[PDB]
């Protein structure tokens, strides 16, 4: 090659020209590589729970309900390329894969995870009158990725693309007010759900 | 609420169909406006097409099956640590799964003006939109047939 | 109870399975939290920054 | 039949003619680095090409 | 026939490409807080020593004493949800019963 | 870039044997008995709106002889307007000569 | 192997897909479900020492 390097292919003249460049190319991209930022992402979960220094009874149930703590986290994934969902859970794991480590150890309850990607039309099983979900079930159906939040906790994608995966995207796709807080999902609170059994017992 | 703050779109496993700029450059006279240089990142683009990364789709038959396995009471995957909290339950699987998969791509970029002398060793470079080396690049054979035009 | 006889509990398990039923060994190792069975994936993806 | 006065141009002023300056420095930043561990200032060498896209 | 020249290849003629991107890094910043991807704008001047804006001014100069045109090929992708409202795969009319008595 | 793919719904008969074994009701089948009001049969073949990306050549066109460093592009929808389901759209175009003055 | 005191235990080279470690937990520093949760992720090669 070297020696060759020197020598010259000599396209000529007294008239310049050009060429038609066709080209073949192949690649192996894992849907979730980090290089394409189908790897990271930000969001904040609960990390602490207590009550100001005295443990129980009158507020024994209510005490638990008096001090919460939040923090922003950049958690990542295991490069690869996965099924629509797969991806989800991975985060919906690694999101947990954070909690576990800090939630348990600081009075945080799985109850208050606060950030759970997921597909489903919570509200479909609604009813007008009860203003609830009559079948005591967010009728288990896939509709389209969705992110559920608790208060204070949120999710920022700014530094990632998975967003485009979650088929959810900013409407002015060229800035950054892009993070999602309990606060923004207005009205979109889950309905709550209803009690089946009880409804039944007292059916007579 | 957000229907304005954002918009509902479909699921892209490619999650970001990106383009990439092809640029060999000790051959082509460099298109208009590019400055000549030898800083791998710039490199005057000869042609560009997007990633050989597209998406295929299939119908997940494992649709209902799971509804009847955790209903028969059995082991838990790190995926469904909350087989009861309606809320925390390994989201339903969709009817349709999607899979990032790359194919190879054969493309014509057009015809270009090239210097009138080529060093036995042309160097080629595929740049990614944020102009850089993409290493998921497999094998890439470019061929090009010069041809005449104009005259002095 | 194998857990109320030792406070006088929750210990029960630190014991990382050692070998499978057919008695094939898992060459666990010391420390008991790491079987000397190394795997491409993990290393790359899960553990070694840049080394 | 196709003969031409086809002229793609734009800003980047015509590599111009008629006289220009030639700056001959010696303590321009890259030069040092790459060429003058050598010796002093009695002689050294210097890139005259003032383009920064070049070692 | 005094000709000072050197590398920086003669602003060349006979045909070249024109790259028309929209997510080139500076562009966004400076011009597309505006809107989306249905329209936006982009510097076509590929020189990095220029803020889109300034560039904006300067001119790519296709020449003359003979006009011409170009071959515009083009790439485009979209995410349309079969039932968006914008395509009216959302609404519809029909009438039902709403009262009964004697 | 919105076309349709199709597949064979295997969940064809399965349902015939689940509401026949007597079980829970989806907001979809509130009338598991009124032949009439029953969550219509599913078809043998399901269809899915899915968009692909499209690469197209539009031809060659006459262009002004001077372009401002900033060309603005715009994809209009039949009722000529902005379509925002538009992802990324890279158009490139190679001028070329023709005619003469 | 058989013929030379080698144990299946110490096979030492087994290609395979799976995310050993997924079923992990921080605290035990182990795999709580007593199972390298049987899931395909992407080919992988597991090794023993020396092999
Ligand atoms: Ca099938």
Numbering used by the authors:
A (entry chain A): 103 to 306
B (entry chain A): 391 to 542
C (entry chain A): 307 to 314, 348 to 390
D (entry chain A): 48 to 102
E (entry chain A): 52 to 153
F (entry chain A): 442 to 542
G (entry chain A): 205 to 255
What's in the article?
Dodecahedron-base is a small icosahedral virus-like particle composed of 12 copies of the Ad3 pentameric Pb protein and is capable of efficient cell entry. Virus-like particles, called dodecahedron-fiber (DF), are generated during the adenovirus serotype 3 (Ad3) life cycle in infected cells. These symmetrical, dodecahedral particles are composed of 12 copies of the viral penton complex, which comprises the pentameric penton base (Pb) and the attached trimeric fiber, both of which are essential for viral cell entry. Through careful examination of the crystal structure, it was determined that residues 48–61 of Ad3 Pb, the Dd building blocks, interlock within the particle through strand-swapping. The strand-swapping considerably increases the contacts between neighboring Pb pentamers which otherwise associates only through three small loop regions.
The atomic structure of the Ad3 Dd was first determined using crystals of space group P213 in which there are 20 Pb monomers, i.e. 1/3 of the Dd, in the asymmetric unit. The structure was solved by molecular replacement using a model derived from the Ad2 Dd crystal structure and refined with an Rfree = 0.290 at a resolution of 4.75 Å. Structural differences concern principally the variable loop, which is longer than in Ad2 but relatively well ordered. It is possible that the loop is proteolyzed in the crystal as N-terminal sequencing and mass spectrometry of Dd preparations often indicated the absence of residues 313 to 347 (data not shown). In both Ad3 Dd crystal forms, the visible electron density for the Pb peptide chain starts at residue Pro48, while a very strong positive electron density (>10 σ and >18 σ, respectively for each crystal form) is consistently present in averaged Fo-Fc maps on the Pb 5-fold axis and coordinated by Glu451 from each subunit. However, during refinement of the Ad3 model based on the Ad2 Pb structure it became obvious that there was an interruption of the peptide chain between residues 59 to 62, and Fo-Fc and 2Fo-Fc electron density maps suggested an alternative trace.
